[PDB]
């Protein structure tokens, strides 16, 4: 078993242009559990990021939520960087406020 993560990047509430919110990276469906997750700001790693406690679904696949407090504008380019045994390269998903 080696299962590849799916990744979602999104805010805790509908994004706004100057309000304090929370930026989330949800990684799910992966195995084994050793994973490197990084939130970025305009391309650079954010340092003070919290993460949920590792759990798993009925198919035994793991999930983890990483989040950082944040105040977005109409463009403060945010992203999530994920490195796992299943990925030859760290995959990067941009915060798209439409989803």
């Amino acid at each position: 078993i080696q299962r590849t993560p799916k990744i979602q990047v999104y805010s805790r509430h509908p994004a706004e242009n100057g309000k304090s919110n929370f930026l989330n990276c949800y990684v799910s469906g992966f195995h084994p559990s050793d994973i490197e997750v990084d939130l970025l700001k305009n391309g650079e790693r954010i340092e003070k990021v919290e993460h949920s406690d590792l759990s798993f679904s009925k198919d035994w696949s793991f999930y983890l939520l990483y989040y950082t407090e944040f105040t977005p504008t109409e463009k403060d380019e945010y992203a999530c960087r994920v490195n796992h045994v299943t990925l030859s390269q760290p995959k990067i998903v941009k915060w798209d406020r439409d989803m």
Binding site: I1, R3, K6, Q8, Y10, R12, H13, P14, F22, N24, Y26, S28, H31, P32, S33, D34, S52, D53, L54, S55, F56, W60, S61, F62, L65, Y67, D98, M99
Partner: protein
């Protein structure tokens, strides 16, 4: 309606980092209420919901003691499984255990569970009857026969139909303000032109609890789940959940399409039109 208490445990061996990582999390329904992480500083079982902080200090001492005992069992187990599978002391391996109980709307016992996995595959699980075992392969057959001798199923059944269900009922009363509450989804719809002859409708459901939900797009009251992108229900981070569903449709045919939302907190499913 019905309710559940679930514990999830993961142990991962690290011949490189010495002692295995051990994480335990407890949930009533979709609300986490306790955690233990061997890599965290406290080395205690920790509260993760306000209603569990009503528990006295014997609770926290006693759960800390038993969760450290759980860890030691899982550590010994990783070494036992390495032998059963004739593996080398070099590699990292993983054990995962889930157990807990469901009650019905009357809060009476409904079902119990205890499942175990090695390196991401089924190893052994307790059947619905809480008296026999499903061993996934020949190595798990040895565990089945050992646990049959020691009445391990009868030990687990006493907990699952007794202790487990009575503590769930207690937690449901102690946390009645939040655990017994349902939060209906906040809904809205967005429209994006992908070309001047096609357009994306996106139906949104936000801030809802519990996580279970169904979002469906219909054209002229006909199913489009096949044609719909449905993202996995995702945690908001504040105890609620989010989900969206989107269809790409011909421009000028937006009015044929309706979004339907079903949720525990909705006394009747609602319909969204553009």
């Amino acid at each position: 309606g019905s309710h559940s208490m679930r514990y999830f445990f993961t142990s991962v061996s690290r011949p490189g980092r010495g002692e295995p990582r051990f994480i335990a999390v407890g949930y009533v329904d979709d609300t986490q209420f306790v955690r233990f992480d061997s890599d965290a500083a406290s080395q205690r079982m920790e509260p993760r919901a306000p209603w569990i902080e009503q528990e006295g200090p014997e609770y926290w001492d006693g759960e800390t003691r038993k969760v450290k005992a759980h860890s030691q069992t899982h550590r010994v187990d990783l070494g036992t499984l390495r032998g059963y599978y004739n593996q080398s002391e070099a590699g990292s391996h993983t054990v995962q255990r889930m157990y807990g109980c469901d009650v019905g709307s009357d809060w009476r016992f409904l079902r119990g569970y205890h499942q175990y996995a090695y390196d991401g595959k089924d190893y052994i699980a307790l059947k619905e009857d809480l008296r026999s075992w499903t061993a996934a392969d020949m190595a798990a057959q040895t565990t089945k026969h050992k646990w049959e001798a020691a009445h391990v199923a009868e030990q687990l059944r006493a907990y699952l139909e007794g202790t487990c269900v009575e503590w769930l009922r207690r937690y449901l009363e102690n946390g009645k303000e939040t655990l017994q509450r349902t939060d209906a989804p906040k809904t809205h719809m967005t429209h994006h032109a992908v070309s001047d002859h096609e357009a994306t409708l996106r139906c949104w459901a936000l801030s809802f609890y519990p996580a279970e939900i169904t979002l469906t797009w219909q054209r002229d009251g006909e199913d489009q789940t096949q044609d719909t992108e449905l993202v996995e229900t995702r945690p908001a981070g504040d105890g609620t959940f989010q989900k969206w569903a989107a269809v790409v449709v011909p421009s000028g045919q937006e009015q044929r399409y309706t979004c339907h939302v079903q949720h525990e907190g909705l006394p009747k499913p609602l319909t969204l039109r553009w």
